[PDB]
Design a protein around this nucleic acid. Structure first.
Ligand SMILES: Cc1c(N2CC[C@@H]([C@H](C)N)C2)c(F)cc2c(=O)n(N)c(=O)n(C3CC3)c12
Ligand SMILES: Cc1c(N2CC[C@@H]([C@H](C)N)C2)c(F)cc2c(=O)n(N)c(=O)n(C3CC3)c12
Ligand SMILES: [Mg+2]
Ligand SMILES: [Mg+2]
Lengths: 222, 481, 481, 222
DNA sequence: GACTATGCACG
DNA sequence: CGTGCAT
DNA sequence: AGTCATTCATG
DNA sequence: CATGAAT
């Protein structure tokens, strides 16, 4: 089930893929419903690189994604949104769902990415506040940004290290990661093809032995 | 191993048990702090657990596990949902819980699980708990018999009237609507001065409720009967504006709906009037509400039957609702139906007992320090002798006896003396001591005044009430016609 | 507000993050305490929260809310289920959580919710935590940065081998079977004496595992290869008896099934062989197990093809299973495949660092008290002068300076002196003090021995290990063929 | 869904109606499956005195109860158990389910009670234990019994005040409330008819005003 | 993490 | 039909 | 409070 | 087809 947008406009219509029903709720709350849609992903997404075709088409999330965007999977193109934006927790499990989503998009909806329609959205990692009726909060997204903020707010101000999207309200979600004029988005391009297909297959693939080496050679366990 | 009991004697007793606990300890508000036990346990636990509004928010699941294991012997779902409600600006007029994350909405959606959210108490909630630490109120044992629990909070304002309550138990129900903190305190205050206050005059200050969703309330005649007897029917109408649309078109805009109605569903029912074509002005129905604003635009066709259409909707959808007063709270451990007057008076008397008890507590604490201080003073004049005598003794208790037999100190006096560390010997100033003694004695006089001088007591009561008023007051959201 | 990143550079990094955390901090055991972080956080929290085995059981929901809000940033379901598992005598060989209520069964049923159950840690679990309070082990900050967390427990026995682990992460899996505490400690101990222990000799003490469900294990040749390389296939057969039934009838009775198999379902599969008539001796299949006993009776018809039938079932149902060794733990922050030897040695060295660190901690504590005591002794010889001097001074710090400049006491010495309460002046006995001094000094000598004398250290290690053995040992449940 | 008994014997077969899936689980665990059945009641039972007939027959619990016992509801009689035993928490909500069950039985299965086949089972209210490997626990069911126990166990022994059936294991459930030789059961008789029908109707009925008086006159709120 | 039935009084 | 603490 | 899908490796 | 910490 999907939470739609009042109007139909492929020129500027956003499709938000959110990690979890609960966060999606918050998503539906704060938002310009005149042109942005929430579509939640009820837990860990199908591995469309390690699953037969029968399973993929039968998967609730994937089908809903397909029929909601329109084109198909061959794929065709513009219907139906001019931004597909992925909004997940900033944690390891969040990162995992980004992996799983781009794998699918990469494999089936491949033109979408090339046309640069797929985005990942960067929720804030930190909130800084300095009590009660008079309280001030600012946001940071990085190591360095927080430094600037801590100096500004100086001593006495408490820091919060957001553990997920659930920890923040709808107004807060709007201000930081949804409102077009304040949001900071990542835009997935692809800077080759083959380099990609190898990476996507080694990682998201049915093999293991190669994944293990990739991890040995690459994952630095200090 | 077998007992015989009749069916007649089993049912009566079992039902008796359930009805009782459900009537008192589950569903019904205390007329004083206007709390139900879950709510009160939530406030009390979060507060005891220093989860105040001025400190960091904390993982709801933690709050509940703690409430559940320490105070409330029931389902986490029940504890949590009730927590969530207290976090809801639309349902309560003065929210008593601040929750971070998805805590629901008016469009009726499902609050996020306790495993996603974070909460702290609000600011005003500390006010209900105010002075709890100064033996101001009756405590009981938790089910474990390991910890004590307030049966009632000090209630620094009249939460019962302000936030309201509903409301389904055994043999009784209770529905009470929200009211303007400011207004209610003004009524409370008057009643303190003129106890025998007639309802008509009280109505002047507290006239009709104040739903957090605002809107239009009509039924002065009815509100009177409610505030009098306890039961009443009053009319609640969403707030309507007319907008004109380029093309000989008219739009009907709604920016407030009646307490406790599902905006998502209300909208569907309106669009349903249009599709099932049950009225003429049916055009498009659009809910355009985003954070920080409620806007429902129902736009019309060409034959702008506007007045006819709105009026139709007023009957046939819930854009106009009727609200019921069934004011049932627990007074003297039992259900009572009540009006502005009893709900007020019971409150006052409660604050009275609270205030007195508080003062009694504060005075004792003072007189105990005064007693020690007086001794500390004497000890200084004989410091040298006393120290030598402590050295002479054989143990702690022995010294205490010697001080008591020799210099006629007391127990409490001896004890304070003997535990004195060495650096305290660094300053033997009769003067600084005497200054404290002076303060303590003025404190005690003052307290003893509030205790045995009903008028001054009632005075303090009013001062505090007014202070709370200024801090927390806000303008009305509901309008009266 | 827009960034560009490639698909190639996104996936690698994201997957990197996930794989890393999943490999280290979720799915894989530490080779030392044999814990996964959830488990360790559970033990550590319940323990810190004085939820020990010797005190009352406490409302699971409370335990979890606390774990979740303070240590483990994940789902309560995950935390709770893992808690429940630790309460399961059939899955673990030495349960580390005691749970009251429905915590599941072998017939595979659903443990009751955390809102129904109650739990405390077990007795033996305190052993893993033993000495944690004496700076014996590396601490980190919780996600809040409000509290510190052990990265590893002192692990007073080899939980890794004893309880085992499984076991699914990214790029690696881990399966390790349970082992007899007693047996494992005997191996550990030998390796302490003879470090270069060859596997063949170690096998003599620790030979094959020990499943809590008992049963028959065959694969000596295979167990060797497992204990050597890390990977192995061994055969597990339920335990079978023959019962004779009045009527020329024979019954096959089963009183132990292989680790990790669903008795409820196993039974269904056996009855299924009978209905689908896939073998001859098919008669009735009955599961007659009640509390305190496992009994599966499969009774036959008349042509008692008993040996043929059991043998058939052995292949075609799970009454006979095969078990796999994939021994993968985290050593130096990274996944390693391992056999009896590394899993042993790493443990030993860990206990070493623990023991040394513990001793270093204990020695300091002593030398600090010794230092104060030595001063207390001097102070007695000049008590009169010292007291007068404290009186002379002007504040606490001033006295401390004066003692230090005048009598050459230290800071720590001055401080202990000046905080002395008055009753302490009651007893000025150089003798009692000197006795304590004597004890402290023998303690320090002893500690300093364990610290700088590897042999004695390794000795203490063995003593403790043996003590744990006697307390907690139990006879084998699995038999080897 | 019902957890049956291996054998079919109406001479001595027990049907346990348990409050909640979870407690029922514990029930199925500890028990002589040779002749006792667990049948759980997933939450608060239909009010078969304040609900039309259509609803009653459609209610999952009730139907399962009817078809499992056999007779019908007219009722007929012996099938199928020679004891129907009600096992609930010893709390207010437990008492409420006992109300709801006997109402149903009283109204429809009325002969069952008259023949004295309906029982209520008395879980213990207290456990007394005096540490670790050597620990001793005894049980009490009343004000007075605990007194005797506390003296026996004397000082040092901790008391537990069971808040529900979930708080105890299967072995414990067996020993105290299920094992025929140790269990203490209540047996519902009826000592009139009309007295009963009035009580059952005033309490469990569609009226309220009368219930309220009953409560005023009878429920002592101290 | 949605859904699913119930009691309890009432308009 | 729906309210809000319970199961 | 059951149920329902999914990841991750592996026999 | 499960296993067991995650969603
Ligand atoms: C069982 C049960 C239900 N069911 C499942 C089917 C139906 C049964 C047959 N009456 C009703 C149901 F529809 C809802 C709940 C529920 O909301 N909360 N919070 C619960 O805790 N439980 C369980 C009683 C404890 C629920
Ligand atoms: C959603 C969801 C499921 N579903 C429901 C249908 C299907 C959806 C469509 N992916 C999967 C499901 F089948 C099981 C769970 C679950 O066990 N635990 N512990 C959970 O927390 N969740 C939610 C993810 C957080 C579950
Ligand atoms: Mg997360
Ligand atoms: Mg209960």
């Amino acid at each position: 089930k999907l939470t739609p947008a009042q109007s139909k406009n492929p020129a500027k219509n956003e499709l938000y893929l959110v990690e979890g029903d609960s966060a999606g709720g918050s998503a539906k709350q704060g938002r310009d419903r005149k042109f942005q849609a929430i579509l939640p992903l009820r837990g860990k997404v199908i591995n469309t690189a390690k699953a037969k075709m029968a399973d993929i088409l039968k998967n609730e999330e994937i089908n809903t994604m397909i029929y909601t965007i329109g084109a198909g999977v061959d794929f065709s193109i513009e219907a139906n949104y001019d931004k597909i934006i992925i909004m997940t927790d900033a944690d390891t499990d969040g990162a995992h769902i980004q992996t799983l989503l781009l794998t699918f998009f990469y494999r089936y909806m491949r033109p979408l990415v090339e046309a640069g329609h797929v985005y990942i959205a960067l929720p804030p990692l930190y909130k800084m506040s300095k009590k009660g009726k008079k309280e001030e909060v600012a946001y940071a997204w990085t190591d360095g940004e927080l430094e600037e903020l801590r100096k500004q707010f100086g001593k006495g101000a408490t820091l919060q290290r957001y553990k997920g999207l659930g920890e923040m309200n709808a107004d807060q979600l709007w201000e930081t990661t949804m409102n077009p004029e304040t949001r900071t988005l990542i835009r997935v391009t692809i800077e080759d093809l083959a380099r990609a297909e190898r990476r996507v297959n080694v990682l998201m693939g049915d093999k293991v032995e190669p994944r293990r080496k990739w991890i040995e050679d690459n994952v630095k366990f200090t | 191993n077998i007992q015989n009991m009749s069916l007649e004697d089993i049912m009566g007793e079992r039902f008796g048990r359930y009805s009782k606990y459900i009537i008192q300890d589950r569903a019904l508000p205390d007329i004083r702090d206007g709390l139900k036990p879950v709510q009160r346990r939530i406030l009390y636990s979060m507060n005891k657990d220093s989860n105040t509004f001025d400190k960091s928010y904390r993982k709801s699941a933690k709050s509940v596990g703690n409430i559940m294991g320490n105070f409330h012997p029931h389902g986490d779902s029940s504890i949590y949902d009730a927590m969530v409600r207290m976090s809801q600006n639309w349902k309560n007029r003065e929210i008593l819980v601040e929750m971070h994350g998805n805590n629901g909405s008016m469009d009726g959606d499902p609050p996020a699980a306790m495993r996603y959210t974070e909460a702290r108490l609000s600011e005003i909630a500390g006010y209900l708990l105010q002075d709890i630490e100064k033996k101001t109120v009756p405590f009981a044992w938790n089910f474990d018999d390991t910890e004590k629990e307030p049966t009632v909070l000090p209630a620094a304002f009249p939460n019962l009237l302000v936030n309201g309550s509903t409301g389904i138990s055994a043999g009784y129900a209770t529905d009470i609507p929200p009211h303007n903190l400011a207004e209610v305190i003004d009524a409370a205050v008057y009643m303190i001065d003129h106890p025998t206050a007639k309802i008509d005059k009280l109505m002047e200050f507290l006239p009709g409720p104040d739903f957090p969703t605002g809107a239009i309330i009509q039924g002065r005649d009815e509100i009177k009967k409610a505030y009098e007897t306890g039961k009443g029917r009053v009319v609640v109408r969403s707030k309507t504006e007319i907008e004109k649309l380029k093309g000989g078109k008219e739009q009907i805009v709604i920016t407030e709906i009646p307490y406790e109605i599902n905006k998502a569903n209300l909208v569907k029912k309106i669009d349903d009037v249009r599709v099932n074509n049950k009225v003429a002005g049916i055009a498009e129905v659009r809910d355009e509400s985003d954070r920080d604003g409620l806007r429902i635009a129902i736009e019309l066709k060409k034959d702008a039957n506007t007045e006819l259409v709105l009026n139709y909707l007023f009957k046939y959808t819930d854009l106009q609702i009727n609200y019921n007063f069934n004011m049932v709270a627990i007074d003297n451990f039992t259900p009572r139906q009540v009006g502005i007057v009893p709900i007020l008076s019971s409150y006052i008397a409660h604050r009275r007992e609270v205030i007195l008890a508080r003062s009694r507590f504060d005075k004792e604490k003072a007189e105990k320090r005064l007693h020690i201080v007086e001794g500390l003073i004497r000890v200084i004049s004989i410091l040298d002798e006393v120290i030598a005598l402590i050295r002479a003794s054989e143990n702690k208790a022995d010294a205490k006896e010697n001080l008591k037999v020799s210099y006629d100190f007391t127990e409490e006096q001896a004890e304070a003396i003997v535990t004195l560390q060495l650096y305290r010997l660094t300053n033997t100033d009769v003067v600084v001591l005497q200054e404290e003694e002076a303060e303590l004695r003025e404190k005690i006089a003052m307290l003893a005044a509030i205790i045995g001088d009903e008028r001054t007591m009632y005075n303090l009561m009013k001062k505090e009430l007014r202070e709370v008023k200024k801090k927390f007051a806000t303008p009305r959201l509901s309008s009266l016609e």
